[PDB]
Design a protein around this ligand. Structure first.
Ligand SMILES: Nc1ncnc2c1ncn2[C@@H]1O[C@H](COP(=O)(O)OP(=O)(O)OP(O)(O)=S)[C@@H](O)[C@H]1O
Ligand SMILES: [Mg+2]
Lengths: 369, 365
């Protein structure tokens, strides 16, 4: 008795065609179809979609299809599905409709309150679409009702597609304290997986569904991309009753080909590879022809042919804000002149001050010629 | 030179018979069909400030029906808050300039020499760094390498030094008459050691020396040339730091001594000659934004770019939208395209429709 399980999923980016590559397009569709399958094979009670199902606002026919099909099944096998539209899905000239509208009888598009019955027990859901940081305020409003309307129920779930302060440290449109106490936070927008306690409840970023940027690979092997299977049986939840489903992605491989020892380590990766990987990074110029050798074990080579001349770090952080004043002074000394003066002679000449003075001064004062 | 545009009002200005427009900061973005009225909004901004000098054709900017032309623009510059006005009634106009409420100059010629120092760049150094007209995204790189060092010498702060040079050339004038003075008195002037005026003659002479050796620390072949050199590497950082986000097939981009662009391909170096339309515009855009970052807190202004996405393909447009968003060293970039991308990433989204020859601005967000 009493058994209620939902699948939290996000950022599929259907329709994305990385490096203009027919294959990578198919890769994105495949890794999604897989999820829908696995999820169809788990007949979970509810599916939470945290946004960015599509890539653009006018996704291609085929992506639209591939979705409408998968979501068809979902609701054909009596699965309830909730989704908030992400940044890629919020129409900018209203009068034109988000692509999500094409899934309207398969899915409920959240921008409000709603309650679902599973095992007579009543649970609470709220969510809303991607809000720029600009309109970040009107948002707090939204989460207020949400908070209020939600106090009444024991179990509550929040769906949002924004980025939040501690979790993306860079570009974010909401902060940690900036949100009320819920039981699970099904989030979208961060592509790396994220799962951790918070405000008595579990917060989560299902993550993407493939490698959309090269930098998600290292992040991919540690934590693996897929979705979250959440067992909301007992009265509470921990990282324990949140099971994670995995999924295989196109493989990436970073080569930094400097010497003979390296060109080999690079071989030790490409063939040590499930399918044809995408290779990226550096490759000294003298090794290029002997790499094109592997142009058939490779999917695509986005690595940089470095000139033989240069042999140092260029991506090396060297924060330079040339302090004009500092430099001028440091310089003038190298030559033999009172920098601390010629500098002062400088500020003075511009503000149209009395130079005679400054000179007449220094002359008598410090000038021992 | 921290400059920002608040709002602007215009009357009888080409297709803009009458309309006012509010300029919110960040990702400002005018948008509209062809001829909606997009560039005029910034033809006008540019009139207000620098009014067409020569007695040019005023039948150009005046709505083809009308007789007059009124434009007034509101902009916070170096902290303060100003307002310039310029008009024209069949044959004659003049320009008033308010400073927080209190006018600093009130004549065509007055407000003129006033707007140059309250901004720091002439009319053409303006179009070379603050207002980048439609067609001229690549202009800079198209310049003679002297013309390049000339416009960069101003945008960097090197011109001021050339002032200090020719200043120190006049200052070495005084302490040389003074020195002649003493020479003339010391006219008719061992066991013979040097007198007091002889000791001053000397000191004053080893002074001039010191003075000149400071003049030359201001010279073209001097500190101007150190500063420059100590500047390129840094610009390069940012150039390549952004050029890469375009995913073009190229190692890095060398930025030379004399601001030449050298595109390192796997077997060879390509110049802005060999690059392609779209490719030129990328490096172009990347360089402008690049120098912006380089003087991050040396001078933080706004920028107007008109169709930055010219020639650029579907992939590149969006890469560039992603770059602009990411851009931090400029508070106001208003951008004028008709393209989808830059829209869907915009703080503001100022829409221009044109109702039969007359244009109407419907500010959004
Ligand atoms: N002196 C004038 N009197 C009345 N209308 C004018 C005058 N000068 C230009 N226009 C009209 O204003 C429209 C162009 O305004 P612009 O700012 O230059 O164009 P735009 O909205 O940027 O369109 P683009 O550049 O092709 S995407 C054209 O249709 C002109 O017909
Ligand atoms: Mg235009």
């Amino acid at each position: 008795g009493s058994h209620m399980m939902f699948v939290h999923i996000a950022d599929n980016h259907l329709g994305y065609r990385q490096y203009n590559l027919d294959d990578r397009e198919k890769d994105i569709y495949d890794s999604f179809k897989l999820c829908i399958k696995k999820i169809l094979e788990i007949k979970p009670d509810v599916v939470l979609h945290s946004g960015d199902l599509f890539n653009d606002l006018r996704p291609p026919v085929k992506a639209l299809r591939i979705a409408m099909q998968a979501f068809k099944k979902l609701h054909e096998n009596n699965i309830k599905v909730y989704i908030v539209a992400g940044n890629h899905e919020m129409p900018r000239r209203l009068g034109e409709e988000s692509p999500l509208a094409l899934l309207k009888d398969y899915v409920k598009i959240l921008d409000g309150k709603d309650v679902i019955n599973v095992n007579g027990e009543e649970i609470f859901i709220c969510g809303t679409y991607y809000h720029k940081k600009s309109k970040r305020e009107e948002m707090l409003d939204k989460l207020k009702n949400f908070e209020s309307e939600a106090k009444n129920y024991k179990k509550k779930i929040l769906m949002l597609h924004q980025g939040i302060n501690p979790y993306i440290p860079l570009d974010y449109e909401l902060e940690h304290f900036d949100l009320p106490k819920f039981s699970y936070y099904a989030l979208g927008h961060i592509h790396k997986r994220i799962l951790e306690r918070f405000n008595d409840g579990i917060l989560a970023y299902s993550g993407s569904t493939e490698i959309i940027y090269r930098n998600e690979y290292e992040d991919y092997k540690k934590e693996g991309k897929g979705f979250y299977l959440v067992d909301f049986s007992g009265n509470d939840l921990d990282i324990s009753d949140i099971e994670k489903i995995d999924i295989e992605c196109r493989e990436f491989v970073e080569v930094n080909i400097k010497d003979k020892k390296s060109f080999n380590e690079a071989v030790n990766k490409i063939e040590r590879c499930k399918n044809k990987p995408v290779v990226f990074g550096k490759i000294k110029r003298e090794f290029k022809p002997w790499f094109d050798t592997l142009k058939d074990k490779i999917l695509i080579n986005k690595a940089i042919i470095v000139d033989d001349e240069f042999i140092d770090m260029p991506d090396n952080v060297d924060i330079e804000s040339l302090n004009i004043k500092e430099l001028l002074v440091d310089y003038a000394n190298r030559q033999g002149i009172d920098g601390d003066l010629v500098l002062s002679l400088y500020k003075a000449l511009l503000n149209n001050e009395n130079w005679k003075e400054l000179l007449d001064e220094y002359y008598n004062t410090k000038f021992r010629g | 030179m921290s400059m920002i545009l608040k709002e602007i009002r215009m009357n009888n200005f080409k297709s803009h018979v009458n309309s006012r427009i509010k300029f919110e900061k960040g990702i400002v973005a005018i948008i509209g069909e062809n001829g909606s009225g997009k560039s005029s909004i910034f033809e006008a901004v540019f009139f207000a400030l620098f009014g067409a000098g020569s007695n040019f054709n005023y039948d150009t900017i005046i709505t083809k029906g009308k007789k007059s032309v009124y434009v007034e623009l509101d902009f916070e510059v170096n902290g303060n808050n100003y307002k310039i006005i310029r008009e024209y009634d069949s044959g004659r106009g003049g320009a008033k300039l308010y400073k927080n409420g209190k006018p600093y100059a009130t004549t065509i010629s007055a407000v003129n020499k006033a707007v140059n120092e309250i901004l720091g760049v002439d009319r053409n150094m303006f179009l070379n760094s603050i207002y980048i007209k439609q067609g001229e995204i690549a202009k800079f790189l198209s310049l003679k390498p002297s013309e390049k060092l000339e416009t960069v010498a101003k945008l960097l702060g090197i011109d001021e030094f050339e002032k200090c040079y020719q200043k120190m050339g006049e200052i070495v004038k005084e302490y040389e008459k003074r020195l002649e003075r003493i020479e003339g008195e010391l006219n008719y002037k061992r066991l013979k050691e040097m007198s007091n005026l002889e000791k001053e003659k000397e000191k004053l002479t080893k002074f001039v020396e010191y003075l000149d050796k400071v003049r030359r620390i201001f010279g073209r072949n001097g500190f101007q040339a150190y500063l420059r050199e100590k500047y390129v590497p840094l610009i390069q950082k940012y150039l390549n730091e952004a050029f890469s986000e375009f995913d073009l097939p190229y190692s890095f981009v060398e930025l030379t001594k004399d601001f030449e662009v050298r595109v390192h391909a796997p077997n060879g170096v390509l110049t802005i000659d060999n690059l392609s339309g779209g490719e030129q515009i990328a490096v172009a855009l990347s360089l402008r934004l690049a120098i912006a970052n380089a003087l991050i807190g040396n001078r933080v202004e706004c920028i107007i770019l008109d169709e930055p996405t010219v020639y650029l393909d579907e992939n590149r447009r969006a890469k560039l939208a992603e770059i602009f968003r990411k851009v931090k060293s400029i508070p106001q970039m208003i951008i004028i395209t008709h393209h989808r991308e830059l829209e869907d990433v915009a703080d503001v989204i100022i829409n221009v429709k044109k109702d039969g020859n007359v244009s109407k601005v419907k500010i959004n967000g």
